Amino acid sequence: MNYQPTPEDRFTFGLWTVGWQGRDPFGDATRRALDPVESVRRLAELGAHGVTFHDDDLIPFGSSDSEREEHVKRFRQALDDTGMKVPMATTNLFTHPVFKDGGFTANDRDVRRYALRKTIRNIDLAVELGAETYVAWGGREGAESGGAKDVRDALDRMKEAFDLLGEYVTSQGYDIRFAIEPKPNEPRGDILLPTVGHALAFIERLERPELYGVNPEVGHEQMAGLNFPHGIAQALWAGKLFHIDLNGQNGIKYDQDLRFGAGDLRAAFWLVDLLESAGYSGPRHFDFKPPRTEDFDGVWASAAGCMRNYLILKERAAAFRADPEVQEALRASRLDELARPTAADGLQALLDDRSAFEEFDVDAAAARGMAFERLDQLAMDHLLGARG
């Protein structure tokens, strides 16, 4: 009577997630390295729809052209053998010491050019393996101190970099779009474009804004104590939710990348509620790290859980929305009134309307309860499976 995921649920996983070897700021790897081909096979057996990669996840840094060929072909045969897809890809511009002050916004001009060139090389690959989205996570763009980075110049260089990528893309006639992934900090003291809001606003300054959107991560917005569903709704309102990274985070601290459903469970529910009601049809991508306490059996247990919790949440939110008792409470709370225009009649009519000011009875309106706590308990009940 369960929640088994199928490739139609569009669940994806990054190679670096289940492949995380468990090295952290204070300790060595607890797990041996996984061959990408094993990961593809194991995730498919679990019902994943596909996998995503960093260039250096697939092809080890410094690899020879003929080594590149080998890594790709082998990866290609695994994806052919399993039906798995590659909907998204990204570049690693944060691990190698050369990127210690950034990729696109490093102070050293020659480093910024190298970063562009390593990114462009990987977009051709990504296109080849059929990704539709290309993610950019500028984890090293930022600073630990105020004098080290002039942020107006850094944003000029960031825009310069995204504009060049967009020009490259259109000239090759590729179908791919870009998704910028925000993070407020870690590993830099502060990171540029630290939240969904910052990312959306930056995009509006680009040459061809239509090529760019956001890839928000649950844990990253929560590292700034923000409401993630609220941020996702602003991205949907803007037509910019191109991709999404799902995981768990317990409040404001280091980036935990726990399995989805872990961390803020109610946030999880409201997010699924929103993705499902808006009709989000992009990949459901997990960016998570199975804790370093675990062996390979716990890794696959943790990955399976990501998908299971999504499905359970999905069922509980459908039940909530469909419940006649909840639809009535939503009317009681005037959500229906929220969706009607405030002044369709227009400015002039508003100004002339005595019932909107001069004869508005503020005190009776003030007295009206919103009935939000009864509504939220109905949501609680539905989440916990305790309606009655």
Interface positions, 64-93, toward its own copies (CB under 8 A): none
- Interface pick for its own copies out of 72, 120, 127, 129 (rule CB under 8 A): 120
> ∠274-280-284 over CA atoms, to 5°?
95
Among positions 250-289, residues that touch its own copies (CB under 8 A) are 250-256, 258-259, 261-262, 264-266, 269-270, 273, 278
The two most distant CA atoms of the chain are separated, in Å, by 80
Active-site residue, 285 included = no
8 Å CB contact between 285 and 88: yes
8 Å CB contact between 66 and 24: no
Q: Is 181 annotated as a binding residue?
A: yes
Among positions 213-242, residues that touch its own copies (CB under 8 A) are 222-227, 229-231, 233-234, 236-238
CA distance 36 to 44: 12
CA distance 254 to 14: 20
Active-site residue, 230 included = no
Site string for its own copies, 149-188 (x = CB under 8 A): xxxxxxxxx--xx--x--xx--x------------xxxx-
Minimal distance in Å, beta carbon 89 to its own copies? 18
135 binds its own copies (CB under 8 A): no
- Interface pick for its own copies out of 64, 66, 281, 342 (rule CB under 8 A): 342
Is the backbone of residue 333 left (phi > 0), alpha (psi -120 to 50) or beta?
Answer: alpha
Contact region with its own copies (CB under 8 A), list: 42-50, 74-82, 128-136, 346-354? 346-354
Minimal distance in Å, beta carbon 115 to its own copies? 9
341 binds its own copies (CB under 8 A): yes
Among positions 347-386, residues that touch its own copies (CB under 8 A) are 347, 350-351, 353, 355-357, 360, 362-363, 365-380, 383-386
Which tokens sit at 81?
């053998």
Of 54, 243, 285, 382, the active-site residue reads: 54
CA distance 303 to 262: 12
User: 299: Cβ–Cβ under 8 A, 6 or more apart, which residues?
Assistant: 18, 31, 290
Mode of pairing for the β-strands spanning 284-286 and 245-246: parallel
Strand (E) or helix (H) holding 178: strand 177-180
DSSP annotation of 85: B
Minimal distance in Å, beta carbon 10 to its own copies? 21
Known binding residues for Mg(2+) are 181, 217, 220, 245, 255, 257, 287
**Active-site residue list:** 54, 57
